[PDB]
Each structure stands twice: as structure tokens, then as C-alpha cells.
PDB file of N, CA and C and ligand atoms in Angstrom:
ATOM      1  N   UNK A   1     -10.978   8.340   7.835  1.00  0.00           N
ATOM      2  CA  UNK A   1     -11.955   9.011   6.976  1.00  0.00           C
ATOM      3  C   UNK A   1     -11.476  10.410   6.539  1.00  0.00           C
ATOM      4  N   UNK A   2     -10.466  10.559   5.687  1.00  0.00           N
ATOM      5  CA  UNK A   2      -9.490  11.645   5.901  1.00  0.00           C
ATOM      6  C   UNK A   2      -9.442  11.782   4.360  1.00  0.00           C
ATOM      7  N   UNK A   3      -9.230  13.675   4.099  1.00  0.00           N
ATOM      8  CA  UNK A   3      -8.917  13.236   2.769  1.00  0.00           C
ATOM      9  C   UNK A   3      -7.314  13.226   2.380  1.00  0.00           C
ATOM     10  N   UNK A   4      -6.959  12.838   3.397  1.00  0.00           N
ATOM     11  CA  UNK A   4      -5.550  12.339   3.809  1.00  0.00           C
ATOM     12  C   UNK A   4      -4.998  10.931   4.110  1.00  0.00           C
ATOM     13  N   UNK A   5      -5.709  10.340   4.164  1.00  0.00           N
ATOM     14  CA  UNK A   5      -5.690   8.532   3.949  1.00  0.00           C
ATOM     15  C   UNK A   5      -6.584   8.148   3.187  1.00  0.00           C
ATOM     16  N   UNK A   6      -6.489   6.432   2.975  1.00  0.00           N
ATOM     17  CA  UNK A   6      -7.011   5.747   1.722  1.00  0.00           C
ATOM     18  C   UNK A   6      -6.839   4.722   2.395  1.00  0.00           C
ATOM     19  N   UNK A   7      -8.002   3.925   2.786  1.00  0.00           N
ATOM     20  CA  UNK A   7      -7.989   2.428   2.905  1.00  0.00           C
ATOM     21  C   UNK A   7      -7.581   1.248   1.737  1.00  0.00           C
ATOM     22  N   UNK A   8      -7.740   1.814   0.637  1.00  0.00           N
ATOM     23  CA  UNK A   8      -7.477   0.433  -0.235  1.00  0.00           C
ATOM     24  C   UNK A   8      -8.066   0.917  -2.047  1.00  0.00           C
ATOM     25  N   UNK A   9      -8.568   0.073  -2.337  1.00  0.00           N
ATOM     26  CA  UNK A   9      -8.916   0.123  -3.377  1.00  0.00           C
ATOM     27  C   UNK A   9     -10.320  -1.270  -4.102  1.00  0.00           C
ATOM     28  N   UNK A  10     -11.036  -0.192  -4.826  1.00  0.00           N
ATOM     29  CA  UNK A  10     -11.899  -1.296  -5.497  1.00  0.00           C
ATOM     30  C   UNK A  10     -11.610  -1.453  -7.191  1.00  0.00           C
ATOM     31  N   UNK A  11     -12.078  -2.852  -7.569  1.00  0.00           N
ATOM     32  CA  UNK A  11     -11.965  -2.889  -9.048  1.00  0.00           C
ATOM     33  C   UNK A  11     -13.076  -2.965  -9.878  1.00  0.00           C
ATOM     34  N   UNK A  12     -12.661  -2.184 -10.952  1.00  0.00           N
ATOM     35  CA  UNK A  12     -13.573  -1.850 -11.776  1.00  0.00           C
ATOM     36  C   UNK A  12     -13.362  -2.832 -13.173  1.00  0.00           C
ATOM     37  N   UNK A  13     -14.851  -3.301 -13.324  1.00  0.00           N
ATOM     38  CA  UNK A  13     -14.851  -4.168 -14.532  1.00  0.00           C
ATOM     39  C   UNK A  13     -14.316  -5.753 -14.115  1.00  0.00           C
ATOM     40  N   UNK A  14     -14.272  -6.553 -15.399  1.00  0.00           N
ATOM     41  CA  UNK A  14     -13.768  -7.687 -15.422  1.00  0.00           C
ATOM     42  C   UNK A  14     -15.008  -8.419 -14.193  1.00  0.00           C
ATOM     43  N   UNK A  15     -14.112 -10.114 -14.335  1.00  0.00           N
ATOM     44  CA  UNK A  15     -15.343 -10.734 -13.186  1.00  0.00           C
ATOM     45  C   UNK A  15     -14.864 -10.235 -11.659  1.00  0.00           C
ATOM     46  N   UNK A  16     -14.220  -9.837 -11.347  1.00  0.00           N
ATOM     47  CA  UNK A  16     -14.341  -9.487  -9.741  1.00  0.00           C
ATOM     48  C   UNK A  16     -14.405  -7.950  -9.944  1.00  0.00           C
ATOM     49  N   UNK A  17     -15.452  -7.382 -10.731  1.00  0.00           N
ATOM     50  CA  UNK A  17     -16.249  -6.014 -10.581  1.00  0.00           C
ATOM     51  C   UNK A  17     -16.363  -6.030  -9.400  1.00  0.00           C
ATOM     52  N   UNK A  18     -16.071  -5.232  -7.966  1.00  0.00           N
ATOM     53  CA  UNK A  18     -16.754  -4.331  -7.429  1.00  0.00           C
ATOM     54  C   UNK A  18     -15.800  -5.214  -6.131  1.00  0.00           C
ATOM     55  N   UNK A  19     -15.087  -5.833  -5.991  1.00  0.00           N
ATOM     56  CA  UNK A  19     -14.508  -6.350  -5.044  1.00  0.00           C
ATOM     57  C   UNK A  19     -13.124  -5.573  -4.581  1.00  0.00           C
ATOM     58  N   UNK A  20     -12.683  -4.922  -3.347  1.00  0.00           N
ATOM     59  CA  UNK A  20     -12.053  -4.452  -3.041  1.00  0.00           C
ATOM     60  C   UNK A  20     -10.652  -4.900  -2.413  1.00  0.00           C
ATOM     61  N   UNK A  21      -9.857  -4.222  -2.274  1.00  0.00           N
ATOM     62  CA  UNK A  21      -8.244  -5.011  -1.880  1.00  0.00           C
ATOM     63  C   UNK A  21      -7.936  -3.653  -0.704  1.00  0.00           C
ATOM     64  N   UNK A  22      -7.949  -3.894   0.001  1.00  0.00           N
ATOM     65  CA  UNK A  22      -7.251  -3.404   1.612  1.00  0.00           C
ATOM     66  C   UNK A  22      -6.233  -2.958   1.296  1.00  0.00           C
ATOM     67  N   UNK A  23      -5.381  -1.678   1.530  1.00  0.00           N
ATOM     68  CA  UNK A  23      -4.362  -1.441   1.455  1.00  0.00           C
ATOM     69  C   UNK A  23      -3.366  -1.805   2.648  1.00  0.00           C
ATOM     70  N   UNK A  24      -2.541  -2.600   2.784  1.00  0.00           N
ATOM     71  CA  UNK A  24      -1.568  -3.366   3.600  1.00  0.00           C
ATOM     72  C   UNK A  24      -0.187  -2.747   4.017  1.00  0.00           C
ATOM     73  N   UNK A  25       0.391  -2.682   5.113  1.00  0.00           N
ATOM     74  CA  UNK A  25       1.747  -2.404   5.042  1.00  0.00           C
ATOM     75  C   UNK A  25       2.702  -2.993   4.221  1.00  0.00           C
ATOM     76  N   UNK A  26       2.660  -3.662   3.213  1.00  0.00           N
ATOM     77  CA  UNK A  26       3.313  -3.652   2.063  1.00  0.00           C
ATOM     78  C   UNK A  26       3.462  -3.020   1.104  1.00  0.00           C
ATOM     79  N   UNK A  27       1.965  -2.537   0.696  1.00  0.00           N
ATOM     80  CA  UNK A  27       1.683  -1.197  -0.360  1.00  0.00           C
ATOM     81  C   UNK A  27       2.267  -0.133   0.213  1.00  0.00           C
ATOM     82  N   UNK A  28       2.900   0.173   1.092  1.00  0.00           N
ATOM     83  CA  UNK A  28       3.439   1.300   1.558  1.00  0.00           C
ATOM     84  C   UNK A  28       4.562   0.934   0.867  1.00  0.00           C
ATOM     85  N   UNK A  29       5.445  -0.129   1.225  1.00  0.00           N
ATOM     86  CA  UNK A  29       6.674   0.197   0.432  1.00  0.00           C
ATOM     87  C   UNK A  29       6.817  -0.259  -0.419  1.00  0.00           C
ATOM     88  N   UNK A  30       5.928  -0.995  -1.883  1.00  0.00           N
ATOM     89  CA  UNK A  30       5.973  -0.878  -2.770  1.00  0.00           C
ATOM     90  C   UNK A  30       5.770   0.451  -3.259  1.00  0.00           C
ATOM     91  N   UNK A  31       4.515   1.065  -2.588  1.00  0.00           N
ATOM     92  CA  UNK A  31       4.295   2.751  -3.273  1.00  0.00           C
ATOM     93  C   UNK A  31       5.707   3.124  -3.318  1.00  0.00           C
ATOM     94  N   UNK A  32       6.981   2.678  -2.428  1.00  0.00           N
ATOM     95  CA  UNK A  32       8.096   3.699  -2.825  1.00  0.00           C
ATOM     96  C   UNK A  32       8.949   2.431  -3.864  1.00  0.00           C
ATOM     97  N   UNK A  33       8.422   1.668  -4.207  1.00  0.00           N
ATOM     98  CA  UNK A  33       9.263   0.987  -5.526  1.00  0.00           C
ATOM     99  C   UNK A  33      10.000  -0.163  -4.491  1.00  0.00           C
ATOM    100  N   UNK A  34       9.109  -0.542  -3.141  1.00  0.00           N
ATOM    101  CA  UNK A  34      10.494  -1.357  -2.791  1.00  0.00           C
ATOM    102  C   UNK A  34      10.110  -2.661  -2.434  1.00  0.00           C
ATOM    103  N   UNK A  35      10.465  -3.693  -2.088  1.00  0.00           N
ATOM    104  CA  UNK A  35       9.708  -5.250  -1.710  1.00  0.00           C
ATOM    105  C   UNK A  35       9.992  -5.027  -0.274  1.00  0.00           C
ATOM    106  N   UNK A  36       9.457  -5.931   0.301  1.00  0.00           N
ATOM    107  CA  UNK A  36       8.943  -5.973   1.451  1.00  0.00           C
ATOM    108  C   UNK A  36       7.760  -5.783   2.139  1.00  0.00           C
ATOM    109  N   UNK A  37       8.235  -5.353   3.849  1.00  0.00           N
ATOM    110  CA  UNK A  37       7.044  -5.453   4.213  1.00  0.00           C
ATOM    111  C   UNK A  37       5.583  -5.836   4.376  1.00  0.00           C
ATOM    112  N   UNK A  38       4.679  -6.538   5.564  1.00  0.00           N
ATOM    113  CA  UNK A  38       4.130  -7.407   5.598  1.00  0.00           C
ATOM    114  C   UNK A  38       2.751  -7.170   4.960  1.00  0.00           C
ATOM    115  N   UNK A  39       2.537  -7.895   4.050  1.00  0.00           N
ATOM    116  CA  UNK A  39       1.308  -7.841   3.209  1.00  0.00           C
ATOM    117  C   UNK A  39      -0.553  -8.476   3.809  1.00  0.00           C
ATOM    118  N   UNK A  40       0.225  -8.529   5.303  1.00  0.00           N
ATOM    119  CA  UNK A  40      -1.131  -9.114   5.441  1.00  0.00           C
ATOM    120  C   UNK A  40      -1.626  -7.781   6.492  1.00  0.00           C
ATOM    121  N   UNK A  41      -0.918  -7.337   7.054  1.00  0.00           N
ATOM    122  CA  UNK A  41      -1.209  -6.086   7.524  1.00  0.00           C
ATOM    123  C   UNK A  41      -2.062  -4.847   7.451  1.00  0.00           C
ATOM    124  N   UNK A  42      -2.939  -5.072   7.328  1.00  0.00           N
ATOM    125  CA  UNK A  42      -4.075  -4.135   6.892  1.00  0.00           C
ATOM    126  C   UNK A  42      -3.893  -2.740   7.565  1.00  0.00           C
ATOM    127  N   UNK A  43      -3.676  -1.694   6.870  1.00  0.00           N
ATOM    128  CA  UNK A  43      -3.438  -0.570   7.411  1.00  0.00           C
ATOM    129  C   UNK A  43      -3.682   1.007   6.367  1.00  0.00           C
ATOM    130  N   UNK A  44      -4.592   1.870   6.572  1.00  0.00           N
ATOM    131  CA  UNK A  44      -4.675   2.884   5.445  1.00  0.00           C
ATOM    132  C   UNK A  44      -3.327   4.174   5.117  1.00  0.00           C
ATOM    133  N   UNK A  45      -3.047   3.877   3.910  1.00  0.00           N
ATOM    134  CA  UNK A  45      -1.496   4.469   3.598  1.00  0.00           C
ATOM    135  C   UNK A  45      -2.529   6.345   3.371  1.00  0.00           C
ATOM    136  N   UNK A  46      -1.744   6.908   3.222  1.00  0.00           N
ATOM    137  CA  UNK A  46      -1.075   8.453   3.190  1.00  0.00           C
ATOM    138  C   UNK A  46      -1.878   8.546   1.678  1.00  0.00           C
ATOM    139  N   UNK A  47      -2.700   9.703   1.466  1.00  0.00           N
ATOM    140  CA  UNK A  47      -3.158  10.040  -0.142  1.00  0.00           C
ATOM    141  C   UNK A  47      -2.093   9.786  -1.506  1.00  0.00           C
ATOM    142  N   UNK A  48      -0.803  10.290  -0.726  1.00  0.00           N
ATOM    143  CA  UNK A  48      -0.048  10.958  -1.611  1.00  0.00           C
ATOM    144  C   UNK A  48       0.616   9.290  -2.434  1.00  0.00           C
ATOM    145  N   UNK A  49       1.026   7.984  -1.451  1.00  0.00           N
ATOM    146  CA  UNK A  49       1.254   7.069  -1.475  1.00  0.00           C
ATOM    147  C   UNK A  49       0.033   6.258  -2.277  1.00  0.00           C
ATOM    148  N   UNK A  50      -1.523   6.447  -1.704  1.00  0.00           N
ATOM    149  CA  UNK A  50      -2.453   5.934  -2.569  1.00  0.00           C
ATOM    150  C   UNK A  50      -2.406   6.312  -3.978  1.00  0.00           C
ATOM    151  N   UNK A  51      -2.069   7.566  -4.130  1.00  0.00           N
ATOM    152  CA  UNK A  51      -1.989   7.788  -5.493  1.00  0.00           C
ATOM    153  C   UNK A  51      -0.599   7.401  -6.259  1.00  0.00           C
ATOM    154  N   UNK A  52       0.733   6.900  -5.809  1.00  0.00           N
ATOM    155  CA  UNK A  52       1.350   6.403  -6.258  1.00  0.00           C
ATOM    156  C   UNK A  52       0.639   5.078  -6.911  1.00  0.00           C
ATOM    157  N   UNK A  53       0.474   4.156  -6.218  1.00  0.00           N
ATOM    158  CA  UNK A  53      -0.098   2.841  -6.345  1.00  0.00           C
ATOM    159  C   UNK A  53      -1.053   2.781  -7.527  1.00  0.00           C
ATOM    160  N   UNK A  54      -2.117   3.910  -7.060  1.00  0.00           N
ATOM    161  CA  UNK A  54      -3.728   3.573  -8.141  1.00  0.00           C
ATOM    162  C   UNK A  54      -2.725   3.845  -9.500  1.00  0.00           C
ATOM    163  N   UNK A  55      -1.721   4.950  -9.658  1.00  0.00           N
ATOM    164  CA  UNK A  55      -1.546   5.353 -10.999  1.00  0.00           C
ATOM    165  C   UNK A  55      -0.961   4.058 -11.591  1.00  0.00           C
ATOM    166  N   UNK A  56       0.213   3.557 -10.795  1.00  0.00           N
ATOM    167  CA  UNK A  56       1.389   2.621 -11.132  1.00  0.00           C
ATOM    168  C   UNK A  56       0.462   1.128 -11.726  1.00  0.00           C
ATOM    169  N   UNK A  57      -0.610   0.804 -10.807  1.00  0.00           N
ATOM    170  CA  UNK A  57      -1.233  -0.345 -11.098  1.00  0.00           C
ATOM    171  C   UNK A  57      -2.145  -0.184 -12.051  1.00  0.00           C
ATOM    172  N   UNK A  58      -2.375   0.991 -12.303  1.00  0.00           N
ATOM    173  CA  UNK A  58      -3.819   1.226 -14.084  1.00  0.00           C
ATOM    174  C   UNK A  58      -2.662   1.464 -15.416  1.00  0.00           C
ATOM    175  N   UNK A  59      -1.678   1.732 -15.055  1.00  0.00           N
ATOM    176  CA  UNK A  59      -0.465   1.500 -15.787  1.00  0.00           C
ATOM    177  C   UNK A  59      -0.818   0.296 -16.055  1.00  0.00           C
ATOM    178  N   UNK A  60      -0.021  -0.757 -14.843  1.00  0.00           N
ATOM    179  CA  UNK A  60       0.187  -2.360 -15.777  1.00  0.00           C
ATOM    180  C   UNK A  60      -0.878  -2.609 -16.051  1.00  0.00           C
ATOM    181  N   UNK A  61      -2.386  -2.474 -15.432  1.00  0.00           N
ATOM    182  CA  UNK A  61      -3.593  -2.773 -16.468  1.00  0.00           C
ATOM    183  C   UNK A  61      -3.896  -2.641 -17.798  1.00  0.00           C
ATOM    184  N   UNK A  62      -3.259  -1.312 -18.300  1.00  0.00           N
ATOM    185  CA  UNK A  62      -3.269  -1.148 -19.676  1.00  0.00           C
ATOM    186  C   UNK A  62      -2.380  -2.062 -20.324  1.00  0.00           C
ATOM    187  N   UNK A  63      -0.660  -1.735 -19.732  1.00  0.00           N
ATOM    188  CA  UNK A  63       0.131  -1.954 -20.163  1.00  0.00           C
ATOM    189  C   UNK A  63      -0.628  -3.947 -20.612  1.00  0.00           C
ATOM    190  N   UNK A  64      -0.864  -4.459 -19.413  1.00  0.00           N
ATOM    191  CA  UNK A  64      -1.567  -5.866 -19.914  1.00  0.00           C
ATOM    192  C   UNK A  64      -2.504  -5.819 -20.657  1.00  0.00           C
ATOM    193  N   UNK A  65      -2.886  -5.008 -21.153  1.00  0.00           N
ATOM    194  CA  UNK A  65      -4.098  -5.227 -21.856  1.00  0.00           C
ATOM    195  C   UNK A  65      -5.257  -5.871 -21.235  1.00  0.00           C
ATOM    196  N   UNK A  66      -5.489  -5.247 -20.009  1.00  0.00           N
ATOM    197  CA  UNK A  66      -6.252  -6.416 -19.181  1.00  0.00           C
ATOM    198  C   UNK A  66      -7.623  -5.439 -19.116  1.00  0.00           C
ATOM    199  N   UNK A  67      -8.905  -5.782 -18.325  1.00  0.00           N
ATOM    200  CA  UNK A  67     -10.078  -5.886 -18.732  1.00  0.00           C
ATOM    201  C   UNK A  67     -11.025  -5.002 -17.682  1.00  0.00           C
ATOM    202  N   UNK A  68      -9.972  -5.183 -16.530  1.00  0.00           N
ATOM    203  CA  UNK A  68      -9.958  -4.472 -15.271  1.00  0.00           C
ATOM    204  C   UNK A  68      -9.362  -3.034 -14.988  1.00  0.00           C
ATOM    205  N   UNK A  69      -9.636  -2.319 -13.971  1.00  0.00           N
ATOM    206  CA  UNK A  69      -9.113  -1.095 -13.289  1.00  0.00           C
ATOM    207  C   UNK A  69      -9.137  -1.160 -11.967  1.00  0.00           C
ATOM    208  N   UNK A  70      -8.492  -0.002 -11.470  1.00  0.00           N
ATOM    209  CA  UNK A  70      -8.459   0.061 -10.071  1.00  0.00           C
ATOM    210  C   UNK A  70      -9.441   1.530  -9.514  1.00  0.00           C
ATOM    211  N   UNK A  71      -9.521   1.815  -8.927  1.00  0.00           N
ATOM    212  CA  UNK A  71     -10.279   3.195  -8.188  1.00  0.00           C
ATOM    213  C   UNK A  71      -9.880   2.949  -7.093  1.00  0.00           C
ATOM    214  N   UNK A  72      -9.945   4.375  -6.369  1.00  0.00           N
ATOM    215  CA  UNK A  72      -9.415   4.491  -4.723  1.00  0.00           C
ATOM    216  C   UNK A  72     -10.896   4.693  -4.088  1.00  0.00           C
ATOM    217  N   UNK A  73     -10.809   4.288  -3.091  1.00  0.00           N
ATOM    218  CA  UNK A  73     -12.262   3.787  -2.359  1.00  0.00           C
ATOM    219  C   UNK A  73     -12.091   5.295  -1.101  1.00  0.00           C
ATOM    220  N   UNK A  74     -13.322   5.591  -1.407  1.00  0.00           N
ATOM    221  CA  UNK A  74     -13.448   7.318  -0.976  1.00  0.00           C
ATOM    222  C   UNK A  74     -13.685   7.651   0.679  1.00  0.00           C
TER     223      UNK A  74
HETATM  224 CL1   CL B   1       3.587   9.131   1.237  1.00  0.00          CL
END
């Protein structure tokens, strides 16, 4: 409960409005651009890392033209 960690994220809009995604030990090392690490791992990453992610993924939302967003869950 830190304003130094981030559990995950919820989405905004589209049909799964309001449904949230866990941030995983995988999103850790994608936040640094890399594959791996286990995605089922539920674990709250570092602000600085959440905000890699929220920016990178409302990117490809636009970039898709898609219908949805992301928000960081407070
Ligand atoms: Cl970090």
C-alpha cells in the first residue's frame, strides 16, 4: 500500500470495463523490454516499473486503435 508499489492494473472502457490484471513477475521484466520470467506469479512491481508498463501498454492501445485503456490501481 505504498506510493512506491503498484499491484497491477485496471481497464478502462471496452467490454471488460473495470476488470483488473495483477501485476506478475513477468511485468517486471518486460517493464525492462525483456521476455521472460514467470507470468503467473503475482507480485506488486516498484512505481517507477508500473509506470514503465501503464505508459508502454496505452501506447499499443492507441497505436491499435483499440477501444480500451489501462490505469494503475491506487
Ligand atoms: Cl524499477
Amino acid at each position: 500500500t505504498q506510493a512506491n508499489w503498484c499491484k497491477g492494473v485496471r481497464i478502462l472502457g471496452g467490454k471488460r470495463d473495470g476488470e483488473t490484471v495483477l501485476f506478475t513477475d513477468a511485468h517486471f521484466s518486460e517493464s525492462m523490454g525483456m521476455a521472460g520470467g514467470d507470468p503467473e506469479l503475482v507480485e506488486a512491481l516498484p512505481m517507477p516499473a508500473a509506470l514503465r508498463l501503464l505508459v508502454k501498454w496505452n501506447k499499443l492501445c492507441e497505436q491499435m486503435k483499440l477501444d480500451y485503456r489501462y490505469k494503475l490501481l491506487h
